[PDB]
Design a protein around this ligand. Sequence first.
Ligand SMILES: [Cl-]
Length: 294
Amino acid sequence: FGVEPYGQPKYLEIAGKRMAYIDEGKGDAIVFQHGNPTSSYLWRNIMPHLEGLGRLVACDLIGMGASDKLSPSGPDRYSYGEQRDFLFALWDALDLGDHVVLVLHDWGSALGFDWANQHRDRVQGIAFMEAIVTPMTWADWPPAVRGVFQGFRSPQGEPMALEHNIFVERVLPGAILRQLSDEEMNHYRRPFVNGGEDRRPTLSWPRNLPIDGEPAEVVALVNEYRSWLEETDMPKLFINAEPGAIITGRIRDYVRSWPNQTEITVPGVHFVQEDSPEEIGAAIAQFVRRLRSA
Ligand SMILES: [Cl-]
């Protein structure tokens, strides 16, 4: 468990806002996308396993990591669609090519599965873990954090996230089996040290989760892309977690139904990269070698 970020930070302005990203190596792209409340930092111990297998790209979502904050910020900002507009523009700017392997977690999986479904001819394979794969009910959601996420999805969410930073301070470490070092935790806290709107992305994201049919637009998006995943012969690598968090139970059964997929299981809850980076990295490398090595 290295504490240092991978690679050098780079920035490009997208719609007048700086977006930060890692871009190392050469060849066909391997694109790692984080979710909430993380950044490219999440992949620092995984990316080294793919050196020499492609061009390794990991972007920080708008409002997250080293990327700029939107202003004026408020409850109408950092929706799925807004996040998608920024990210997909950054990916276009980076000229990723047409043999992309996506490596996806959490909201990074909704964004990446959506991108792949819109660019089917440019995606070579998808590796995913603890991903958003189907509309949910609360029965699918980890029991220990049902009240907290229902809380986020109410007016209580503003104090919880913007004042108390509960996503970063409580949800993130609660969903890692090991204890992070102070140094690692400081990297996850850095984008969100200031109280108030700086923390808005951490609150907007849970409000987009497709749970009991709301928000309908996200439910519809996920139904669309999963309808493709269910039938496509695109190669897939499912990294299961034990105990896991959002892919457990019937959702885990469902993902296992998808075609042209292999899996592994690693120890972890939600932020599996922080419990099992060597096993994850090794599996993705083996996947990519099978797809590419000759
Ligand atoms: Cl979330």
